[PDB]
Design a protein around this ligand. Structure first.
Ligand SMILES: CC(C)=CCC/C(Br)=C/COP(=O)(O)OP(=O)(O)O
Ligand SMILES: [Mg+2]
Ligand SMILES: [Mg+2]
Ligand SMILES: [Mg+2]
Ligand SMILES: [Mg+2]
Ligand SMILES: [Mg+2]
Lengths: 336, 319
């Protein structure tokens, strides 16, 4: 919706003012405004907007006031602040050139490893936003605890991802489907899928842990498909205006994991020799192996089977959770 | 810090590691959880733990003697370890900018203190004041780190930025809030002391003590008996700030040419300039005058706050 998008985007400048406008240190508050402006509001705010839509589908219709929808928007921006902090740090760790076509924050003049402090600063800032707008509401402490717990879990995911590499070289013995599933769950699914929905639930005063658990079961399955589709399109997508670098980066990708499952010893040796190498010819060799191993056909089967399995699980959801929310998430990911 | 206080405090650490690395819960990610145990063990419990123990001593000197149970003194110890988790995250961030530590270990160790707070304090009246204090001190400490960084550009110190106003702000935000205010305000909250005027009264004195602590530290970096790298690193130190205040144009030119250079000869040139500028005598005057002002302010402490706590902190720094 155009109206939902514009109402959401209009909140961002107020949050920057809340975090910057400490009158004894104006130079560093002006700098922090630039950190937020560069890293937080550009490109798609899918997670932030999903927080608002989750709330709108969980709350009683008569309680959906402009005031409460704006509170859902502020929680959405707190998700975007967490994500901005994570991506500032990840770009430094991976020594990436760009994100969404923008030069990475750490590459800007006189940032570099100061990006680590900026990461911690941006993550810390969301709790000041929560205090300003939520400190008098019953959802305050549950929402604080959710953000701190998702941060902790996301760090476990990032560190597990790092345990698949040694001295900038992929450890292919670590590239198992069990490890892949765990990386996706902790590194991406918690902050991308669980956090927006659990925030919507708390703002709607839904505190039943069993409701959050039932939601989690579905959201982790959808999150797994989301990342697998993302991994698939990195190699096999139409260059969306993005050029995929997962192979060059030596990522523990669904493609790399399934390639190792399906590979004979000779095919395994091609992965060992060429995976995670900077040479364009090495990326071409890996892509050619993925084609040879029939990974496109394997993804097509997984895409249809996973859709049916998740649809079945959503029909089985109970304890008064709305099915339409989970069907709508399923539709926007699978695009059907 | 007494033998009993120190030993009881240090005995809590292994429980905090078990709490954070899912001991009792049967985790689906045991290899990264085992790694996080090693991150905590290798970086958090080593050295003196002054901030952690200061949290326990603050609580013991603020609480009613009747309420000082083993259980409550242990809770003060857990709050002290949350301060030491913050300290460890800041030291890791320092080590990462210097050089098995991963970049996200500083974020992860910082985040872990909030898991400890939730575990032990979520059902107590002091919970929200304590988490809001950590949120605020976290944000202010990051502001302080960035203010320090604004004194350097393209690997060179920006000496025009080296003002006493900027120096005082760096020390307050980067160091004094988490080192001095945080332990005492935590002790006060655990003792159910919520009065904003009491917290403000403590803050005035603790920011003054924090400033002396850092100025003494800066002085000893150049003039202590060993090795200090503040000059080589181009740090906005009290010595550099006062050197610029006291320098004639020729002396300023020596700072401009030799401050923040890697050559050992350039460090010796700056130390020789500090000597001819009378920074030792200037420090001696500052130390006596600051001691007298802080002693006066502690004697004047009101709002029902105990003097002995602030005198114990003061005497620990001034020796
Ligand atoms: C704790 C912490 C800093 C987590 C980062 C989480 C995320 Br989301 C990292 C991004 O994942 P990845 O580097 O695999 O892909 P890309 O950079 O989007 O191409
Ligand atoms: Mg990356
Ligand atoms: Mg990464
Ligand atoms: Mg991708
Ligand atoms: Mg990328
Ligand atoms: Mg020093």
């Amino acid at each position: 919706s155009k109206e939902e998008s514009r109402e959401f985007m209009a909140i961002f400048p107020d949050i920057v003012r809340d975090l910057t406008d400490h009158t004894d240190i104006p130079e560093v508050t002006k700098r922090f405004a630039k950190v937020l402006q560069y890293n937080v509001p550009t490109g798609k705010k899918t997670r932030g907007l999903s927080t608002v839509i989750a709330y709108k589908m969980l709350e009683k219709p008569e309680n959906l006031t402009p005031e409460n929808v704006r509170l859902a928007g502020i929680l959405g921006w707190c998700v975007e602040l967490l994500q901005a902090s994570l991506l500032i740090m990840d770009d430094l760790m991976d020594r990436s050139e760009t994100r969404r076509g923008q030069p990475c924050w750490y590459r800007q003049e006189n940032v570099g490893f100061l990006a680590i402090n900026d990461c911690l600063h941006v993550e810390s800032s969301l709790y000041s936003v929560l205090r300003k707008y939520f400190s008098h509401l019953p959802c305050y402490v549950p929402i604080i605890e959710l953000f701190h717990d998702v941060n902790f879990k996301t760090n476990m995911g990032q560190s597990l991802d790092a345990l698949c590499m040694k001295d900038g070289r992929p450890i292919l013995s670590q590239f198992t489907m069990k490890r892949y599933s765990s990386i996706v769950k902790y590194k991406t699914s918690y902050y991308t899928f669980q956090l927006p929905v659990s925030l919507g639930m708390y703002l709607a005063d839904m505190y039943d842990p069993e409701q959050h658990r039932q939601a989690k079961t579905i959201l982790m399955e959808i999150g797994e498909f989301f990342q697998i589709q993302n991994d698939f399109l990195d190699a096999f997508g139409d260059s969306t205006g993005k050029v995929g670098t997962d192979i060059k980066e030596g990522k523990c990708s669904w493609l790399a994991v399934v390639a190792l499952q399906r590979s004979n010893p000779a095919q395994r040796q091609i992965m060992e020799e060429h995976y995670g190498r900077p040479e364009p010819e090495s990326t071409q060799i890996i892509k050619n192996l993925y084609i040879e191993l029939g990974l496109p056909a394997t993804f097509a089967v997984y895409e249809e089977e996973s859709f049916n399995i998740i649809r079945t699980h959503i029909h089985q959801i109970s304890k008064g959770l709305p099915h339409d929310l989970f069907f709508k998430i399923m539709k926007k990911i699978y695009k059907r």
